[PDB]
């Protein structure tokens, strides 16, 4: 039983690492989406002038 539990915990740790990785990738993509929206807002603030 102890061996089974240990092996399961090792797999759990590895899976959690993989999840952290996918979260990191998503966060990077969202960071660029944020930068793009910031630039568009800047352009709009410029374009508001008459």
């Amino acid at each position: 039983r102890f061996t089974s539990n240990i092996k399961g915990l090792t797999q759990a740790a590895r899976n959690a690492n993989d999840g952290i990785s996918v979260a990191q990738t998503t966060e990077g993509a969202l960071s660029e989406i944020n930068n793009n929206l910031q630039r568009i807002r800047e352009l709009t603030v410029q374009a508001s002038t008459g």
């Binding site: 603030v45 508001s48 002038t49 008459g50």
Partner: protein, 49 residues
Amino acid sequence: TNSDSDLDSIQDEIKSRLDEIDRVSGQTQFNGVNVLAKDGSMKIQVGAN
């Protein structure tokens, strides 16, 4: 004490300068917008919102 010829010359030069005023009224432009050719309003955005 001015004869008719003097009045005619003065009128000619006055009309010349009036035409100059009208021309500069039409002429003065800024980025394709005539500043003095209409009674419009011009908004300047100086705020973040």
